[PDB]
Amino acid sequence: MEPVSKLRIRTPSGEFLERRFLASNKLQIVFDFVASKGFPWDEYKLLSTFPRRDVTQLDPNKSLLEVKLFPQETLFLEAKE
């Protein structure tokens, strides 16, 4: 058994992208997922619950566990200006 992070990512219009990730995965892997769905890290913020933080500004080589995106997180996509 390993720790898993369950992520839900809300698109600007209100639909949800969902994937489970090993908590050991690097954040890059989460960036890859959103990119794959049309919402790349360089174009869209990934906003967390309070305290608010944009996960696209974190170190992409850090694990989900290290950046505290575990075990369940809903993130909101928002276009970068």
CA neighbor of 26 nearest in space, from 62, 69, 68: 62
Tokens at residue 30, please? 């989460």
> For residue 24, what is the domain's CATH number?
3.10.20.90
Note the resolution in Å, 1 decimal: 1.6
* Structural domain for 67, as ranges: 1-81
Query: Quick one: 51 exposed, middle or buried, by C-beta within 10 A (0-12, 13-18, 19+)?
Result: exposed
Count of domains forming the chain: 1
Query: Three-state DSSP class for 63?
Result: strand
Would you say 30 and 21 are in contact if contact means Cβ atoms under 8 Å apart? yes
